[PDB]
Amino acid sequence: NELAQELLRKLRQKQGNWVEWGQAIASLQKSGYNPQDIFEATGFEPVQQNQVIVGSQVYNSLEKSGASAATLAHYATRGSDVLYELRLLTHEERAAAGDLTFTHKVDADEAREIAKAIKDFSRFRILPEGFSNHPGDAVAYQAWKLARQYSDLQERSRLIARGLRFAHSETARKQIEQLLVDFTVVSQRPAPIPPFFRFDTEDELPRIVPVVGQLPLKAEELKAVPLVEEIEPFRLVKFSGEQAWVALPGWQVLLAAEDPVTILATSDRFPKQNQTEPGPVLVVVDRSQREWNDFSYFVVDHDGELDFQWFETKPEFPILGKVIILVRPRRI
Amino acid sequence: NELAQELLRKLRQKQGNWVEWGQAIASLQKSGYNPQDIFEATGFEPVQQNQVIVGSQVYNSLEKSGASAATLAHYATRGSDVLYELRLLTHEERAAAGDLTFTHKVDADEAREIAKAIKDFSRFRILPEGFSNHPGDAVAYQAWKLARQYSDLQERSRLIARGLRFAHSETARKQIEQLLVDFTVVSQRPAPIPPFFRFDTEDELPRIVPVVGQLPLKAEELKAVPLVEEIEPFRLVKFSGEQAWVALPGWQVLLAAEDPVTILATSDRFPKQNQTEPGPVLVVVDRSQREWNDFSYFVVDHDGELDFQWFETKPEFPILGKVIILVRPRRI
Q1: What residues of B are in contact with residue A325 (Cβ under 8 Å)?
Q2: If one looks up domain A207-327 in CATH, what number appears?
């Protein structure tokens, strides 16, 4: 192209300000370039790629939601690592935090904690006594609650100083001043361990498979079913129209299948195998397996309708797919 | 009601012809009555319930697709077990088979084989030499190919007689007459064993779970996601609009969940657990678990947007669901 080589050139030189870079890197992902592609062409590491996209998204919130014009001048050319740490905030509480981080000329580590403070503090419908919702009070409320847990050292003083540096309101300053008179512990309980599961390396994950419908069915109905694209990293499946789905185990032949599809039918569509009576069967076919052979079953276009047969001799026919799985319903 | 007690009464008396019964039993399933309900009220066993629904569906094809008026007179009051065995045929080849089964006054076992013959024979684009597509020739072609495999007994004669009884065309009669002169084997290979899988009793099946979207998200987006109804016997899921899906393992807490929903997010929405860096996490919440407690995490309406927090004290809030699963993407 022409705009796909000029954007990459700007990044290769680090021409503009970092905000520009973040938008250029947005524009390349938008148009197909993965992190690894961009690092090949430009110098940009993929860590720094992510930092500046998100960083610019934050800077955008700093613009839309009304931070100081002095703030924007500073963060337009510097402080991508800092704005990146405000990512989990909201647009409105980003502009507030950004004004605060400019004011106190804050490095990225300290801004990570400022952001933690601002979120912890916005989980109050009724606010703590003496503290307002200005992020200075919020990071001062954090300095308050932390200093009380310590009972021993000059760390109390260091944290009391912090709270006084940051606090916005007079009421919060005095709430903090009280800790120079009042020496008691209030310790806090640690947060509960969240319910983590690990996908086991040693066994296989399930696969979601589309479902055309119950036989009797028409050849057009099967061919109208799109191929499914699993969206990494969690193998999601998004789809727009009407559809039915089934989640099946990760059998080897099913993970293998390039394009599988499910058809509900009965066991008497196939040769009777033992003595048991005709019941419901779930049939999986791979549409991308259409070469004949004499040991397997296939879905065929039987003049406008779907049918499962087998073949002793190469058929003068179109084969729509190959049957890879037959399964009866789970027991009682 | 009033029409839900009069239909059941007609079945309780066996008032009309069996075709009527099949439609009445259709009408009760249409309006909520399961097989077991109907057997409680009427005498009708649920085997005979199924036979007469399907049977009447076949009889319907006998009408639409133009069988003899004499046939319909016979099958209107008799022969439900016979028409049931023609179920896997098509509308057009049902009327043909029905004319044939009337003509030869055939019991249900023999009609099961007539139907097998008619389907095997319609898998020919080019037909066998001497045989037409009239079902008489088809069941005669079956008698032909079977008699050749035997080389020994009067079973050849019995089968030759059958073929001559049924055959429609003169050309097929002579194809069969030849087997009184010509005594050779042509044996046929048995059909391949189809690829059967059994759902293992001893381990758990996967569960398909809806996906709202990637945080940041709005409280309305989660509440607009319907509950999912798994359609037995294969736990299908059908849905009309736009939706995203994920198939997760059958963990105990997930099968338990009455109404689970998936939210994509990052690990730094929760307390940092070990040293590892913030990555993507998949979050499962049960919307039907909204009672507070101090050992777990919940999704809350944070003034119009979704948020995961925990609680030391009962919150003056609405809880939208409880977090039951956190999982990172599968390893490399």
Answers
A1: 195, 197
A2: 2.10.109
